[PDB]
Amino acid sequence: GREFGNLTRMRHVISYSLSPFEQRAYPHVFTKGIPNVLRRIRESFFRVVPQFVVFYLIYTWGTEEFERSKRKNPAAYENDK
């Protein structure tokens, strides 16, 4: 079960391969590669991105509220007189 000699029992399968020296290292990396990457990105965009956008909104508001708190209070001095 841990040696290539005996791992599983398969039947009726064929495989075809070519030598590394008989083929290009970057085949269709301009017409077929980029579109596949775009498919990958698009297929998982809405599953991740939006949550991290919420994080950014929480981060900005926080900082804004923190600084907003340190501003002096005109309502604590109107009557101080």
Partner 1 sequence: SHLDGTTPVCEDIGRSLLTYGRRIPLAEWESRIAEVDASVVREICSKYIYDQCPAVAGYGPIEQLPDYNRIRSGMFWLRF
Residues in contact with ligand CDL by CB under 6 A are 29, 33-34, 36-37
Instruction: Please give the DSSP secondary-structure letter assigned to residue 26.
Output: S
Residue 56: Cβ-neighbour burial (10 angstroms; 0-12, 13-18, 19+): exposed
Comparing CB distances to ligand CDL, the nearer of 14 and 37 is 37
Q: Smallest gap, in angstroms, from Cβ of residue 43 to ligand CDL?
A: 14
Question: CA 67 → CA 60, 70, 77, distances in Å?
Answer: 11, 5, 20
Q: Smallest gap, in angstroms, from Cβ of residue 35 to ligand CDL?
A: 8
Q: Interface with partner 1 by CB under 8 A: which range of 5-13, 28-36, 44-52, 60-68? A: 5-13
23 scored as a contact of partner 1 (CB under 8 A): no
* Distance (Å, whole) CA 50 – CA 71: 32
